[PDB]
């Protein structure tokens, strides 16, 4: 719910999907994450029409980059720097114009995370994980990939295919290992 430069010219989430926004701080303990010279953001992105008078802000659309990322360096050299680029008659004529802002780097690097989730109809294949949903549930129940069932898994040996991941015994039933990673949890009836 903000009409600052960030939503205008830098980063916009979708309003049609559920979204989250996370502010964090890398400790010291985390060392593979390197800091840059400073924090930079775009504080102006507009077009000057071919009439040399009309200024039209170029707003960023969700899931896209600013049209000004072509002229704004990956880090802004100095607070308030401005960028320009004349447009070809095909591009519309006039100019493209931008201005960058800076904030001083911090002791510990500070980051931003934006998450966007889509709930599908049947394709909900991005789920959490824990460890009951896994071993050692050495009694009833399991619920594997497209198959239901109630079984007592045991570390058995050693009969199967091992590349696709069930084993049946001459009927609809599965007797029964696979799937675990990677062993032989042969199942039984209730």
């Amino acid at each position: 719910s903000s009409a600052g430069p960030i939503s205008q010219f830098n980063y916009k989430q979708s309003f049609s999907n559920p979204t989250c926004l996370i502010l964090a701080t890398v400790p010291h303990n985390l060392t593979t994450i390197t800091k840059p010279l400073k924090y930079s953001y775009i504080n102006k992105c507009s077009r000057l029409l071919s009439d040399d008078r009309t200024e039209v802000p170029q707003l960023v659309n969700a899931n896209q980059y600013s049209p000004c990322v072509s002229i704004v360096p990956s880090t802004v050299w100095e607070d308030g720097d401005y960028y320009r680029k004349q447009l070809s008659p095909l591009e519309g004529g006039g100019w493209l114009v931008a201005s960058g802002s800076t904030v001083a780097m911090t002791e510990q690097l500070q980051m931003g995370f934006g998450i966007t989730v889509q709930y599908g109809t049947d394709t909900n294949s991005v789920c959490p994980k824990l460890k009951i949903a896994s071993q050692l549930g050495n009694c009833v129940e399991y619920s594997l990939y497209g198959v239901s069932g109630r079984g007592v898994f045991q570390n058995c040996t050693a009969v199967g295919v091992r590349q696709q991941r069930f084993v049946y015994d001459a009927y609809q039933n599965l007797v029964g290992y696979y799937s675990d990673d990677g062993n032989y949890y042969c199942l039984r009836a209730c």
């Binding site: 009969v159 199967g160 295919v161 590349q163 599965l174």
Partner: protein, 49 residues
């Protein structure tokens, strides 16, 4: 569509001699399913002994 690398820049093709009679041989290797010749394992599931 996918980039599959450049077109050939050659202006001709290599000449090809077709001589079917040189390839007409009898080297029989018939299906013997006793030895499981030509068997696709079943897709739906997999099995033991």
């Amino acid at each position: 569509y996918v980039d599959v690398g450049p077109d050939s820049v050659k202006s001709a093709c290599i000449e090809v001699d077709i001589q079917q009679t040189f390839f007409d041989k009898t080297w029989p290797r018939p299906i013997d399913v006793s030895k499981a010749d030509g068997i696709i394992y079943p897709q739906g599931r997999t099995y033991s002994n």
